[PDB]
Amino acid sequence: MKSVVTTVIAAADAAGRFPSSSDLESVQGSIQRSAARLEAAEKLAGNIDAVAQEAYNACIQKYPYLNNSGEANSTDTFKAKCLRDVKHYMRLIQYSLVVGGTGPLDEWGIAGQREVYRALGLPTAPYVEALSFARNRGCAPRDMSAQALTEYNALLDYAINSLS
Amino acid sequence: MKSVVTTVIAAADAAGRFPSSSDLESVQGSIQRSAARLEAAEKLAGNIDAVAQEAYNACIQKYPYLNNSGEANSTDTFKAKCLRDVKHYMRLIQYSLVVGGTGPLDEWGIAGQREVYRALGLPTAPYVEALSFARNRGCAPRDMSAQALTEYNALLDYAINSLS
Amino acid sequence: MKSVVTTVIAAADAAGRFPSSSDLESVQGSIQRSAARLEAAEKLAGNIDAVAQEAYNACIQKYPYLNNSGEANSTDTFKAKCLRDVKHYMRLIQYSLVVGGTGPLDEWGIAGQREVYRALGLPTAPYVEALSFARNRGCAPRDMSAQALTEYNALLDYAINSLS
Amino acid sequence: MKSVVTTVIAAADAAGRFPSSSDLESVQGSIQRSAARLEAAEKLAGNIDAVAQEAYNACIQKYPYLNNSGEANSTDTFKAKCLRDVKHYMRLIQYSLVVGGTGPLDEWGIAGQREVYRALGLPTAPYVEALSFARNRGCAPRDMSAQALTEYNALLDYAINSLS
Amino acid sequence: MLDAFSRAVVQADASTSVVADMGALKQFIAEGNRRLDAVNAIASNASCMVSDAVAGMICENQGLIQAGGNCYPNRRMAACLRDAEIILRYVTYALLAGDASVLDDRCLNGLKETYAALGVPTTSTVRAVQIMKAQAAAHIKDTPSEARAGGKLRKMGSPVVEDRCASLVAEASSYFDRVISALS
Amino acid sequence: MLDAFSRAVVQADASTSVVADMGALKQFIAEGNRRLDAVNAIASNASCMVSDAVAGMICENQGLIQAGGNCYPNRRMAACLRDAEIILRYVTYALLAGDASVLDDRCLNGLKETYAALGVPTTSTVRAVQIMKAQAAAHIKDTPSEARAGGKLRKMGSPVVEDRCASLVAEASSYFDRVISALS
Amino acid sequence: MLDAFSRAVVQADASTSVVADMGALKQFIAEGNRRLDAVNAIASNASCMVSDAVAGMICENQGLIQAGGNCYPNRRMAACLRDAEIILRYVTYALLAGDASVLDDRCLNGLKETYAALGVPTTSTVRAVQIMKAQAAAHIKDTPSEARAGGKLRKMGSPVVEDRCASLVAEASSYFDRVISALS
Amino acid sequence: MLDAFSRAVVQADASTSVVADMGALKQFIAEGNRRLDAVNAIASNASCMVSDAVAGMICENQGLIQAGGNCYPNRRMAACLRDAEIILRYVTYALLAGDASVLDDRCLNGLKETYAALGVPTTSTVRAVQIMKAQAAAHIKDTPSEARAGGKLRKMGSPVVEDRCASLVAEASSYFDRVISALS
Ligand SMILES: *[C@@H](C)[C@H]1/C(=C/C2=NC(=C\c3[nH]c(C[C@H]4NC(=O)C(C=C)=C4C)c(C)c3CCC(=O)O)/C(CCC(=O)O)=C2C)NC(=O)[C@@H]1C
Ligand SMILES: C=CC1=C(C)[C@@H](Cc2[nH]c(/C=C3N=C(/C=C4\NC(=O)[C@H](C)[C@H]4CC)C(C)=C\3CCC(=O)O)c(CCC(=O)O)c2C)NC1=O
Ligand SMILES: C=CC1=C(C)[C@@H](Cc2[nH]c(/C=C3N=C(/C=C4\NC(=O)[C@H](C)[C@H]4CC)C(C)=C\3CCC(=O)O)c(CCC(=O)O)c2C)NC1=O
Ligand SMILES: C=CC1=C(C)[C@@H](Cc2[nH]c(/C=C3N=C(/C=C4\NC(=O)[C@H](C)[C@H]4CC)C(C)=C\3CCC(=O)O)c(CCC(=O)O)c2C)NC1=O
Ligand SMILES: C=CC1=C(C)[C@@H](Cc2[nH]c(/C=C3N=C(/C=C4\NC(=O)[C@H](C)[C@H]4CC)C(C)=C\3CCC(=O)O)c(CCC(=O)O)c2C)NC1=O
Ligand SMILES: C=CC1=C(C)[C@@H](Cc2[nH]c(/C=C3N=C(/C=C4\NC(=O)[C@H](C)[C@H]4CC)C(C)=C\3CCC(=O)O)c(CCC(=O)O)c2C)NC1=O
Ligand SMILES: C=CC1=C(C)[C@@H](Cc2[nH]c(/C=C3N=C(/C=C4\NC(=O)[C@H](C)[C@H]4CC)C(C)=C\3CCC(=O)O)c(CCC(=O)O)c2C)NC1=O
Ligand SMILES: C=CC1=C(C)[C@@H](Cc2[nH]c(/C=C3N=C(/C=C4\NC(=O)[C@H](C)[C@H]4CC)C(C)=C\3CCC(=O)O)c(CCC(=O)O)c2C)NC1=O
Ligand SMILES: C=CC1=C(C)[C@@H](Cc2[nH]c(/C=C3N=C(/C=C4\NC(=O)[C@H](C)[C@H]4CC)C(C)=C\3CCC(=O)O)c(CCC(=O)O)c2C)NC1=O
Ligand SMILES: C=CC1=C(C)[C@@H](Cc2[nH]c(/C=C3N=C(/C=C4\NC(=O)[C@H](C)[C@H]4CC)C(C)=C\3CCC(=O)O)c(CCC(=O)O)c2C)NC1=O
Ligand SMILES: C=CC1=C(C)[C@@H](Cc2[nH]c(/C=C3N=C(/C=C4\NC(=O)[C@H](C)[C@H]4CC)C(C)=C\3CCC(=O)O)c(CCC(=O)O)c2C)NC1=O
Ligand SMILES: C=CC1=C(C)[C@@H](Cc2[nH]c(/C=C3N=C(/C=C4\NC(=O)[C@H](C)[C@H]4CC)C(C)=C\3CCC(=O)O)c(CCC(=O)O)c2C)NC1=O
Ligand SMILES: C=CC1=C(C)[C@@H](Cc2[nH]c(/C=C3N=C(/C=C4\NC(=O)[C@H](C)[C@H]4CC)C(C)=C\3CCC(=O)O)c(CCC(=O)O)c2C)NC1=O
Ligand SMILES: C=CC1=C(C)[C@@H](Cc2[nH]c(/C=C3N=C(/C=C4\NC(=O)[C@H](C)[C@H]4CC)C(C)=C\3CCC(=O)O)c(CCC(=O)O)c2C)NC1=O
Ligand SMILES: [Cl-]
Ligand SMILES: [Cl-]
Ligand code: NA
Ligand code: NA
Ligand code: NA
Ligand code: NA
Ligand code: NA
Ligand code: NA
Ligand code: NA
């Protein structure tokens, strides 16, 4: 699972090396930046349902055709699954803030997503709009510090880029 | 040349990735640790001749046989080359402090060293004693801050390990 | 294990061939040269302890610093091990005379030697000097015939070249 | 081209080795065996036309069907080429005697022979019978020494085996 | 590959001397957080940049999407989008390192010859790269315009200084000019 | 491979839940500098550790260096020294990551079976790993003895606390104990 | 691989002892030219031996060349002829070396399992090997019969001794017996 | 590769003719033992030759070990010692075979071009080879000087003739001259 420390260990093992100066220096980066990303992780852990709910609401407001007969937000089962999916993306973002790399989002969200949505006939634009709303919504210092918000916003843009 | 930043770029490139969260975080580690290693680098730059002289002197003191006819410290040409070689290692350590990885020492000092010394019949024990003396010599806060000393000592111990 | 006959069989097997003219010719060479090399093998078998003892004494005479506190010939255990090592090289030389190729010396003496001596801090010059003394010592017809001495000296030089 | 010395050189080069004891011993085999094979080579250099003519005659005596319309010995051009082909094989055996390995026969006679004869509808039994006659014909000391004949016969049998 | 500090060490080794002047190195370090923001501004916006740059190249030259054009049929448009993204990725590696060696060695070496053998047009490739250069400058300064954003505008929120990281804009622009020089 | 934080994420994902205990993550970070000291203490003394451990295994069992012994002839002694260093390398990766997965997956899986097929003696392998476990403890606490140092004593000079990093000594000792369990 | 001389060296190395019995070595050298003749007698007649041994296995078991039999259809007969030749070739290497290790290590190790997985019948394999053993003994002695050869008969003309190389006959026969042993 | 005898064969095959001249072949055989002594004299002394020749090149051209020199840093010194040994090894193969084809085909073909791409200096390469040529001549004649060897002097003890193998010295020298011509 990709993080600061797993990346330097994999590089060291490929060359047969003990941890050296540049490996320890990399991990010092994690010690310094952890305060920002862990602040974001804590705010998201405590408020994930409301954050997901308003991002889901925005994507339906942009695309009301989804409520029409036969479309992807039209039944009670479909509505519940779409909100669930937006919450899954935010949970994997929470995990990625904890780890300090994109690993949890890469392995459990992004891998396979295009194949699943194509098989089920789900459009990608509502996913992009949910994440886009979440990316433009936060401000500092109200919601979290400026550097906490920089970390949260970077992961939202990483998920948007994977769908675009 | 191995450093914090070239390690993370090489790993990103092997997976076809833009720089991401963990790559920037690794580089923040270089911003934080640079004060300690650049302090050591500036001390070594200003005093290299005296640091190398005392390490050289300590290795000949341990192995006075090298002064006997036919041995590796026995002529004026050999004495000058042996001091020069101790200074080459210290200059590579200074460069390694500047870069923040072992790259310059790996590429320009360690690579080929065992083949060279075996071909010329140069014993490796005096090189290890010179570097050993230098590793045990420093103290903080006299010579530099305690973290600058930690950086200097780790590169000395990396060189010692390559000969041992 | 490398000998005249194992070399030619390996070549034949790599090409899927029965033994042919040049293979039988090569083994006739073994028949011709065996008298010289088995003469040397018999002399060494009967006198290995004295041959090794004087080579060991020669290397300590060259490098008396080895008897000083901390050094590699300084204790009773160390002194016994060093003599033992010189006798191991001579025994592998005996075996190589019997076989007619360097296989025994290659597999049981040379492979790994530089890694072992690095790890234990053992200088290679005293090994070279022991073998060099043995290489310069013999004369014909006193010790053995001129061709037997040629065989014995060639294997001593092969061992010295592997450490140089 | 396969001989005693090229086989040992190729083996040494694959392992990055200087010539060593077993390589020199192999070449002594060439010194010893050369007298017998060069005797056979000199006999063949002086009398190749007669040796080939009688072997050709024997293969036609055996298979008179080859003289019938449409068969492989039926025209003046075909009769000349068949005799030429027996003389080619004898020349390549003369070469192999000079070299002390099968290289010239392998590279210039054997390689491709089955593809050529299949394409032209040339039967292999007459080739075998020409070489078989030549194998059974010689006797020592009338024609050459016993060991010269052993070398000539082994090369005839090697050719016969390549067609069988 | 080299980075800014190992480039300085290669210079010192040409005369077998210690690295003495550390003023330029200490300034690189003091500007380190702003360089990490500049990289974050390009990586975070990279899909929008690539699609808008290839689309602009096309709207200025309709021949590319007609019979015989180098973005026709679907497979060629897809190959072009892939190449603009590869180019931008290597430029971003150069900006993170503060040195062009990764870009020169792993992307530009042989690229002219490759495009000549395929019939990929130089003029059009240069225009795409020029549009990416402009986009990157605006994203580093954190001043993209609504008029060009097509409803997809992003603001980074980095701490503002009067010059808006002019030194880093010039360095990024010099990397895109190196790409163009390799093709011209 | 996993690290201490990605381990916690896997555990949270087994109930599709957010990671809620921020206190425990924070204390891990608060010990991060002492963790980097601990890793530096092992890596910086590795050659001395390996050669002393293999020599100690031997001085306690002379059968290994006589006819039929598993460190005879030179090639076998050299393979043994190689393996003691590989094992220590993977233990140091686990200490850096704060999780055993790299050690289990890249070193220990199938090692017992490999050794059984070669006839590498289990008792002797376990003794070498025990000596390295003891050495690592002393270097992490920065209390190696002159009696054991063989004249090659090193001091790390890290800031002393009363417990001398007892928590990290226990953690490192646990990874050596995983190696011993795997080979026994 | 080992030869007769390196086998003696491995035996001495088991007690870290010099090789002391020069008489046994000198005997192998004395019989060297005879050994070369023995190897020449087998290699020179190899094609005739393989074809006659496979044909004999068949004339004694006609089931092999009917539907369901392991020398039916053409591809299987061809594979069986190839295997008989491979086996003979490894036997001749063992004879040249004076030791079975190249035969054991490069031909026989895994052969029983290979044949069982393919359904190659052991009973018939044994017969082909037995006929090659008999042929080799007669060629080494330079006493093949007109009855078993017809116009294919060959005479070697080696210098005759009263025992016709009994010890080399017994050693070659032992290598064919090892091939048969490896099938159970 | 070819040897002295296969060279004769290739020359005869060019006119589809038998090898007629046995005399020159028999002379090679007559000098066979002295040729084996000449190869033993180089192979046995190869490490001393290589290290002395590279050291000599350097003592005569100190720019090689100063800033920008082609034997700086350690890795370049190590590569040069490796190449001198390679060249000596191929010259020794050619002397054993009595023909230059192995040295031309496996060492010299393309080597001038390789060195021009790397910048390995021709004058210094040639000087290293010239020293080895002188060394080889003195070891073949068994007349090395104490002045050039000190305590590393070796005597071979081959049986002396008045010319000290003048024909083989000229042949060995011709192979070193071939290397110098290819590389100049
Ligand atoms: C290793 C020591 C051998 C050995 C070697 C021989 N060296 C021979 C000649 C020679 N060596 C050098 C290099 C030397 N001269 C210098 O000025 C410097 C550095 C200050 C060095 C290292 C040179 C230049 C020459 C002369 C080459 C030429 O003629 O162009 C030599 C042959 C001459 C002789 O023996 O008198 C040999 C054999 N000799 C030994 O016995 C050990 C095994
Ligand atoms: C974990 C991440 C996380 C977030 C990013 C936010 C996301 C978020 N923001 C708001 C809610 C809000 N967010 C803002 C912010 C702004 N309004 C502006 O005009 C400025 C541009 C900007 C900076 C002051 C405001 C003013 C509200 C209250 C009014 C509203 O709902 O729009 C709410 C509704 C609940 C509330 O009032 O707090 C939520 C869930 N919360 C989180 O837990
Ligand atoms: C761990 C990561 C992870 C995810 C992100 C989701 C992804 C995901 N979503 C659905 C399944 C679905 N997802 C939706 C989603 C939507 N409806 C809309 O109007 C919008 C386009 C959109 C929300 C933005 C719908 C409607 C289904 C059901 C589709 C169907 O059954 O046809 C399925 C198929 C299996 C199922 O029925 O649940 C999967 C794998 N699951 C995971 O395991
Ligand atoms: C770039 C790296 C760098 C270094 C590591 C030092 C290395 C160094 N140390 C000393 C010199 C010294 N260093 C010490 C230190 C100690 N004495 C002890 O017994 C304590 C354990 C330890 C901490 C107080 C002392 C006391 C001297 C002066 C006396 C002496 O020469 O031993 C000197 C001689 C000049 C001087 O007085 O400073 C040098 C070159 N200098 C450098 O430029
Ligand atoms: C298996 C290999 C094998 C050897 C190579 C020899 C090695 C050897 N040589 C000598 C011993 C000797 N060796 C020599 C030889 C010489 N003195 C000279 O001045 C000449 C240059 C040279 C040729 C005559 C002499 C004269 C002695 C006795 C004096 C001395 O010990 O130096 C001794 C001491 C025992 C003895 O006296 O024989 C030994 C072990 N023995 C062996 O078993
Ligand atoms: C260096 C080695 C070497 C050889 C051994 C020969 C092999 C050889 N023979 C022939 C060609 C031929 N060879 C024969 C031979 C024979 N007729 C018979 O009745 C017998 C079966 C048989 C002699 C024993 C015939 C008749 C042809 C001509 C066949 C044709 O053109 O149809 C050809 C085709 C080209 C040609 O027409 O010459 C070749 C390559 N050539 C070589 O370069
Ligand atoms: C280069 C190789 C080479 C050869 C192998 C021979 C091949 C050869 N042999 C014979 C000729 C002969 N060869 C023999 C030999 C024998 N008769 C027997 O019954 C015995 C078994 C056997 C041993 C005495 C005899 C008796 C003749 C003369 C009668 C005849 O032609 O059959 C001739 C005719 C010319 C002559 O009379 O010599 C030729 C070309 N020549 C060579 O140049
Ligand atoms: C590491 C660096 C690296 C690169 C930069 C690329 C370079 C590259 N591009 C293409 C391949 C291509 N590249 C383009 C690009 C374009 N067409 C246009 O009209 C525009 C001007 C332009 C985009 C701006 C097209 C159309 C092809 C396909 C050409 C064809 O097959 O006809 C190919 C051939 C193989 C393939 O089809 O993928 C290669 C090697 N690959 C790399 O590995
Ligand atoms: C009709 C076809 C056609 C187009 C497709 C566009 C293509 C286009 N885009 C930009 C120019 C730009 N394009 C962007 C891109 C973006 N800004 C954001 O906030 C998003 C994240 C992202 C993707 C939309 C930016 C940032 C600029 C820089 C200039 C600016 O922002 O004002 C430029 C100016 C280039 C220059 O100065 O040389 C052009 C020609 N124009 C056209 O004529
Ligand atoms: C791991 C991820 C990571 C990052 C993404 C950066 C994020 C980051 N940027 C800055 C800090 C800064 N960032 C900028 C950047 C800019 N100013 C402008 O006017 C332009 C819009 C833009 C051009 C690049 C500036 C100017 C500062 C203030 C410090 C300085 O002057 O360099 C700071 C220091 C705190 C502060 O000053 O508030 C941090 C932590 N660092 C990291 O560790
Ligand atoms: C007769 C042969 C023989 C040996 C070779 C040693 C081997 C050996 N070393 C240590 C024990 C140790 N060995 C070291 C090693 C070192 N300390 C340093 O300062 C250096 C950098 C480094 C290499 C010398 C350390 C740090 C300890 C821990 C105990 C201590 O330091 O007192 C132990 C105790 C193990 C345990 O507690 O289970 C043993 C048996 N003992 C023997 O009986
Ligand atoms: C009906 C089918 C059928 C066969 C195909 C044969 C097969 C066959 N061949 C031999 C036996 C043999 N076969 C050969 C072969 C040869 N001798 C030569 O001179 C040539 C170079 C070469 C190929 C012909 C030899 C040398 C013997 C040994 C016995 C002898 O020579 O008398 C034996 C006896 C094996 C034993 O003792 O157990 C058998 C059964 N017999 C059959 O019943
Ligand atoms: C490079 C190719 C090459 C060879 C093929 C052999 C060929 C060869 N064989 C023998 C010599 C011999 N060969 C045999 C062989 C045999 N006796 C019998 O009765 C059996 C039929 C047969 C069993 C194997 C015998 C018995 C001798 C006589 C020497 C002895 O008794 O060992 C001799 C010595 C002749 C002499 O004294 O001058 C030579 C050179 N050597 C070689 O160098
Ligand atoms: C397997 C390994 C193996 C070898 C190493 C050689 C060893 C060897 N060399 C010679 C024999 C000889 N060796 C030399 C060599 C030389 N004379 C000089 O004056 C120069 C110093 C030197 C130049 C090369 C000479 C001159 C002879 C004598 C025979 C002759 O004149 O050619 C002999 C014949 C016995 C004798 O004459 O004493 C042997 C067996 N042969 C082998 O089988
Ligand atoms: Cl040494
Ligand atoms: Cl046919
Ligand atoms: Na994308
Ligand atoms: Na080491
Ligand atoms: Na060497
Ligand atoms: Na055949
Ligand atoms: Na090791
Ligand atoms: Na079976
Ligand atoms: Na030239």
Author numbering:
A (entry chain F), B (entry chain C), C (entry chain E), D (entry chain B): 1 to 164
E (entry chain O), F (entry chain R), G (entry chain Q), H (entry chain N): 1 to 184
Task: Please quote the authors directly.
The major light-harvesting complexes of cyanobacteria and red algae are the phycobilisomes. These large, water-soluble pigment–protein complexes bind to the surface of the photosynthetic membranes and funnel absorbed light energy into the chlorophyll-containing photosystems. PEs are oligomers of a basic heterodimer that consists of α- and β-subunits (conventionally referred as αβ monomer) to which bile pigments are covalently attached through conserved cysteine residues. For example, see the quantum mechanics/molecular mechanics calculations performed for the cryptophyte PE545 antenna (Aghtar et al. 2017; Curutchet and Mennucci 2017 and other references within) based on the 0.97 Å resolution structure of PE545 from unicellular cryptophyte Rhodomonas CS24. In the case of PE from Phormidium sp. A09DM the pigment present is phycoerythrobilin (PEB) bound covalently to PE protein via one or two CPEB–SCys bonds; its structure is shown in Fig. 1.
The description of the atomic resolution structure of PE will be presented here using the model based on the 1.14 Å data for the crystal grown in NPS conditions (Morpheus C8) while the model based on the 1.38 Å data (crystal grown in carboxylic acids mix, Morpheus G8) will only be mentioned explicitly in the cases of significant structural differences. However, another of the two PE structures we are reporting here, the one refined based on the 1.38 Å data obtained for the crystal grown in the mix of carboxylic acids (Morpheus screen G8 condition) presents another case. In that structure, the conformation of the 146–152 fragment of the loop in β-subunits M and X is the same as in the 1.14 Å structure, but the situation in β-subunits N to W is different. Another more tentative binding site for phosphate was also identified in the α-subunit forming H-bonds with residues Gly112, Arg114 and Glu115. Both these sites are close to the central cavity inside each trimer.
